[PDB]
Design a protein around this ligand. Structure first.
Ligand code: HEM
Ligand code: HEM
Ligand SMILES: CCCCCCCCO[C@@H]1O[C@H](CO)[C@@H](O)[C@H](O)[C@H]1O
Ligand SMILES: CCCCCCCCO[C@@H]1O[C@H](CO)[C@@H](O)[C@H](O)[C@H]1O
Ligand SMILES: CCCCCCCCO[C@@H]1O[C@H](CO)[C@@H](O)[C@H](O)[C@H]1O
Ligand SMILES: CCCCCCCCO[C@@H]1O[C@H](CO)[C@@H](O)[C@H](O)[C@H]1O
Ligand SMILES: CCCCCCCCO[C@@H]1O[C@H](CO)[C@@H](O)[C@H](O)[C@H]1O
Ligand SMILES: COc1ccc2cc([C@@H](C)C(=O)O)ccc2c1
Ligand SMILES: COc1ccc2cc([C@@H](C)C(=O)O)ccc2c1
Ligand SMILES: CC(=O)N[C@@H]1[C@@H](O)[C@H](O)[C@@H](CO)O[C@H]1O
Ligand SMILES: CC(=O)N[C@@H]1[C@@H](O)[C@H](O)[C@@H](CO)O[C@H]1O
Ligand SMILES: CC(=O)N[C@@H]1[C@@H](O)[C@H](O)[C@@H](CO)O[C@H]1O
Ligand SMILES: CC(=O)N[C@@H]1[C@@H](O)[C@H](O)[C@@H](CO)O[C@H]1O
Ligand SMILES: CC(=O)N[C@@H]1[C@@H](O)[C@H](O)[C@@H](CO)O[C@H]1O
Ligand SMILES: CC(=O)N[C@@H]1[C@@H](O)[C@H](O)[C@@H](CO)O[C@H]1O
Ligand SMILES: CC(=O)N[C@@H]1[C@@H](O)[C@H](O)[C@@H](CO)O[C@H]1O
Ligand SMILES: CC(=O)N[C@@H]1[C@@H](O)[C@H](O)[C@@H](CO)O[C@H]1O
Ligand SMILES: [Cl-]
Ligand SMILES: [Cl-]
Lengths: 552, 552
């Protein structure tokens, strides 16, 4: 009934009704004009002919290793290239933010309420005749059927990029500081009001929780020693709320501060490592500043760990999953002469696309043993049993599964994969093709183009009937992967903008924060600028086992 | 004890301790180097001997009415000029913010906790030997003595720029959406979590309060009719809490939603005007959008009012108090090709300097009656008796007091002025001269240079003993005014940057927001772009009396 229900405005033009049956498109700053912002201005015509496809670019980034070897060692070209990826991605994100589940137009309520996930595309209106607006049937296909036909795993498909379990659990640990859906309110509500990398999954979302996790000497976090090893403190000792089955032994009720982290020993492995790391930095910082009190040591160490995280995320984690020969660089200075907003709001679609459960293996192989999901969940005695050094060595060696390419969601998390479909619809997401347009991709013309094969394509066609009505979540996991890659085109071209905006958006990247005094001087500053996944493990894990995100 | 107590680092360098008795200066990006960042880089040398003093620039702006008469008419020149005032002012403020009452170093708590006012200069550390750090006596001069000698009004001093009571009350009403001290918590803490121009003073800080004030029809705010005139609804009807003395007879307990606006009829006057204006705009939107529901009517009207507010503050309000012949311009597009952060945090010092109580008369003259403070306070009946038309006519006609120049604080609010001195010390403000360097002004070398006269200068010199220990607040009210001006140099050079960043940093000024469709189409947009103090009054006040911020 709403005249904007068909999504008539193209190229990021905004649609507004102008009567019960009529509409208008606002083409301001789009580079186009016309009734629907489809006829381009002269300069636009030119930018367009010059613009290479995401697929062409990706080819160039994953070939010619010899040329990249050179570029990488010419600091000024490396900086030039990295500047361009940074800015070209980030300009895809609305900032300040617009739209959320309840608002398909820009209200002060949508801007000011930090309780919502923001939304890259506005929700389909409540009165549209079909779930996707105007197209398709009255009803999307039964979600159980989609799940079973194209998502559930038959045989385990390994990631051809060699992503290991260190990678999979880092992703889960790092992302769960900003994906924290508030189930009391609905999907599309978050409990992580920091809307980014604030390390609340280490220090607690609220001051109350932080103070419970704190030792209040030397800036340190509370902990216990079992065997000769440092672990998070207990729930009984700190009185912080955690989520645990009621039968779990007092000693194994680890507290840590993201309340959900005790349900997977892999999460708790990183919780322990980061806890250890905070306290290691306190020691260095105390050594450097005998004058300092507890508050300042805690607060400075926290700023340093924020930097270390972003460093690692860009130069090891994103580096790995990109498959690029170009060496990505964490360097806030790249943006000091650019237009850039040091702020971030996490999008609901970013939560959605980050559901990478295909990464999970059939069993968890902690060198020697092989645990089933049932055995693994809410079970920290495994961590105690094997210790951190083992775990690192084991997780470094076990391949994770491929994410795109279809049929690789472990049955053990089927209920989760289904909820993603259901909550997507509940939140009234626009189609896959609407999202491809939003991010400057060409809409798919058939399911067979989406998957690159024929079997899954046909199953999808019988269910959806029209490609322009295919949904975002199912499509990301079923999409044709890049040649020997973990992800398809859509995952990368939507993921990258959200990701890099969240990373560089941080206040510690702003000119006023990005200087040595912010981090306790030159010493604290180097901890950030030399941080890596290897040194994180090396410094904090008993032996000094080798790791990477790659299974070698 | 703190080695940084002397504030050694100059030119915006940051001090850090490096041991119990030593310190280091971080000169990064200051344009200076050396132990205290006082030795300028070459390009910095050129900039300095090419930079006109604030007084030179002020002179140029307040003279040559002939030339400015030409420039105001070259859209091209007006723009580039306004662009330069916006950018150079704003670069003076840290954004993202740094420091608050409790943190004289960066910290994530200082960044993330919106309950604090930010701070342009960090507090003086608790353990410093003297209140100003290292200079002056172990104690600051008795605040009663400072108050009585150089602050209290003997004879009324009228503003030479001709400010009237429309100006004074506009000031109070507008600033009180972002200055809302949380007294429960302390000075340094605010209840305006929106940190800017969000119109919470019309709509409420929380969603619970907003809903209580809302009609839920046609997007409107609840109101009552008394005689044939529209007034805010009552406390008993809306259940929204207000602050009123118990003797107030319900029925005059107007709601309005900044809970403090009952205690001055001049505040209730504007509250009434903006409430009428909101419902007026709903009528206009409804006419353009027969198909819109209540929610979008409400939200769109709110965005439009925000726009009107910003427009009026810049082109009528700031315009008047500036005394410039150059015609200021509200135009977000001026910043689209510039680096600029669309975010704000209101500074404690901004609150401090806006304590413009000298504006207030000894009696409030509403055509025919001369009301005293005791009679004016929390007394809406005066508003009901005279009406909005009378009130605008009277307020437009009565002059305000001069602010700088000393000895013009109304005796009626002497307790308030004393609290300002006392709270500044409580919040550990740095000295006047520290704040002057921070905003690129020369430190004053004697009290006599500060005041421009002799008698107060000598009074101050006996109290403070040393000019480098003079306090900021008392100084602003005692400072030598610009020629026939309302304020002295310090007020303007501090206030302008806080004010302009506060205005332009609003999300509706950002590229994605600044477009016709945000405000419901070209007619909604035009309300923003044509708004003025005169038009605000003409549309909503019975007859349509002439108004101005200037006495005629
Ligand atoms: C043993 C490993 C894992 C288990 C047991 C698990 C299970 C779960 C469960 C029960 C949920 C909540 C679903 C809901 O509340 O609707 C969830 C959500 C989620 N998962 Fe996993 N998962 C695992 C691994 C991973 C991995 C490797 C990733 C990689 C990115 C990931 C990404 C996410 C995300 C982004 C959410 C949404 C979080 C939120 O909105 O609060 N998970 N998972
Ligand atoms: C009848 C008129 C006025 C009265 C009765 C009045 C009285 C007061 C009082 C009692 C306070 C609270 C003091 C405290 O908490 O220590 C205050 C604060 C303040 N006043 Fe006024 N004042 C008036 C007009 C004005 C005007 C015209 C301005 C112009 C800017 C102004 C600026 C301020 C500011 C910025 C604060 C701080 C508010 C906060 O932090 O919440 N006042 N005033
Ligand atoms: C030749 C490769 C070096 C430059 C690196 C650019 C990497 C990211 O470039 C991306 O590619 C897409 C298609 O071109 C665009 O849609 C994106 O906006 C752009 O950010
Ligand atoms: C510097 C040399 C430039 C050569 C660019 C090679 C581009 C070929 O790249 C091809 O583009 C397609 C995109 O639609 C993809 O489907 C293919 O997988 C990809 O190989
Ligand atoms: C992973 C186990 C759960 C899914 C089985 C039930 C749904 C049936 O799904 C079918 O499974 C076949 C075998 O893979 C495919 O050949 C078909 O294309 C597919 O539709
Ligand atoms: C284009 C020519 C520029 C010259 C403008 C005149 C500058 C005078 O500026 C002077 O600066 C002093 C600063 O302390 C003030 O005390 C004076 O009041 C002020 O007149
Ligand atoms: C006369 C030239 C056009 C008018 C623009 C200047 C008005 C505001 O510019 C101000 O001037 C001061 C002195 O240089 C600086 O200290 C301020 O930082 C700057 O914002
Ligand atoms: C969250 O999911 C992703 C997926 C791919 C990404 C790729 C980049 C880099 C390589 C990019 O192409 O600019 C960054 C973040 C990414 C995040
Ligand atoms: C709160 O106090 C002030 C005082 C002077 C101001 C001057 C400007 C303009 C004219 C300017 O000088 O840039 C803006 C805000 C201002 C605020
Ligand atoms: C100039 C132009 O392209 N106008 C099109 C119109 O033909 C179409 O009916 C409408 C609905 O999608 O979209 C628009
Ligand atoms: C959201 C948040 O953390 N608010 C905190 C509040 O809890 C605390 O009372 C205050 C003083 O420490 O700082 C602020
Ligand atoms: C939630 C929290 O820990 N905050 C505490 C709170 O008890 C106190 O009233 C407030 C006053 O500043 O700050 C502190
Ligand atoms: C509840 C559950 O599955 N228990 C497991 C158990 O099977 C396993 O022997 C142990 C290893 O430490 O981890 C726990
Ligand atoms: C190189 C230099 O200027 N050193 C100065 C020193 O002379 C002075 O005692 C001190 C004042 O704070 O600051 C430092
Ligand atoms: C701080 C704030 O306004 N939070 C609001 C909350 O009250 C409301 O429940 C929710 C959904 O309307 O939007 C959010
Ligand atoms: C989704 C959600 O939490 N909705 C809330 C509602 O529970 C509450 O009654 C109201 C009060 O502000 O705010 C809104
Ligand atoms: C308690 C008090 O001061 N009452 C005043 C009264 O003096 C004045 O006549 C009346 C009408 O405007 O306003 C009220
Ligand atoms: Cl990410
Ligand atoms: Cl202002």
């Amino acid at each position: 009934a709403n005249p904007c229900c068909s999504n008539p405005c193209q190229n990021r033009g905004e649609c507004m009704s102008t009567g019960f049956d009529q509409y208008k498109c606002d083409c301001t700053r789009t580079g186009f004009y016309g009734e629907n912002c489809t006829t381009p201005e002269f300069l636009t015509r030119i930018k367009l002919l010059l613009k290479p496809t995401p697929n062409t670019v990706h080819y160039i980034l994953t070939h010619f290793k010899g040329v990249w070897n050179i570029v990488n060692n010419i600091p000024f070209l490396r900086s030039l290239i990295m500047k361009y990826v940074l800015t070209s991605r980030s300009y895809l994100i609305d900032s300040p933010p617009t739209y959320n589940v309840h608002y398909g137009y820009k209200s002060w309520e949508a801007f000011s309420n930090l309780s919502y996930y923001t939304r890259a595309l506005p929700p389909v209106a409540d009165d549209c005749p079909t779930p996707m607006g105007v197209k398709g049937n009255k009803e999307l296909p039964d979600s159980k059927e989609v799940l079973e036909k194209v998502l559930l795993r038959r045989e385990f498909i390994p990631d051809p990029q060699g992503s290991n379990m260190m990678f999979a659990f880092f992703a889960q640990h790092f992302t769960h500081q900003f994906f924290k859906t508030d189930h009391k309110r609905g999907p599309g509500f978050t409990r992580g009001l920091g809307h980014g990398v604030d390390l609340n999954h280490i220090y607690g979302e609220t001051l109350d929780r932080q103070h419970k996790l704190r030792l209040f000497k030397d800036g340190k976090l509370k902990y216990q020693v079992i065997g000769g090893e440092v672990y998070p403190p207990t729930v009984k000792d700190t009185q912080v709320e955690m989520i645990y089955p009621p039968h779990i032994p007092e000693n194994l009720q680890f507290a840590v501060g993201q309340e959900v982290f005790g349900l997977v020993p892999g999460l708790m492995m990183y919780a322990t490592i980061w806890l250890r790391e905070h306290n290691r930095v306190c020691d260095i910082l105390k050594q450097e500043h005998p004058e300092w009190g507890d508050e300042q040591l805690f607060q400075t160490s926290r700023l340093i760990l924020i930097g270390e995280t972003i460093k690692i995320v860009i130069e090891d984690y994103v580096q790995h999953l990109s498959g690029y020969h170009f060496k990505l660089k964490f360097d806030p200075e790249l943006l000091f002469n650019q237009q850039f907003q040091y702020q971030n709001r996490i999008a609901s679609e970013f939560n959605t696309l980050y559901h990478w459960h295909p990464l999970l293996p059939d069993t968890f192989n902690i060198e020697d043993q092989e645990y089933s999901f049932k055995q693994f969940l809410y079970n920290n005695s495994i961590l105690l049993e094997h210790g951190l050094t083992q775990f690192v060595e084991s997780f470094t060696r076990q391949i994770a599964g491929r994410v795109a390419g279809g049929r690789n969601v472990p049955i053990a998390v089927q209920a989760v994969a289904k909820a993603s479909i259901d909550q997507s619809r509940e939140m009234k997401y626009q189609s896959l093709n609407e999202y491809r347009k939003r991010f400057s991709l060409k809409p798919y013309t058939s399911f067979e183009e989406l998957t690159g094969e024929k079997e899954m394509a046909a199953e999808l066609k019988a269910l959806y009937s029209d490609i322009d009505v295919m949904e975002l979540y199912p499509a990301l996991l079923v999409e044709k992967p890049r040649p020997d890659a973990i992800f398809g085109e859509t995952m990368v071209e939507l993921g990258a903008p959200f990701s890099l905006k969240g990373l560089m958006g941080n206040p510690i990247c702003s000119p006023q924060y990005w200087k040595p005094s912010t981090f306790g001087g030159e010493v604290g500053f180097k901890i950030i600028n030399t941080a890596s996944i290897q040194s994180l493990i090396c410094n904090n894990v008993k032996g000094c086992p080798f790791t990477s995100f790659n299974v070698q």
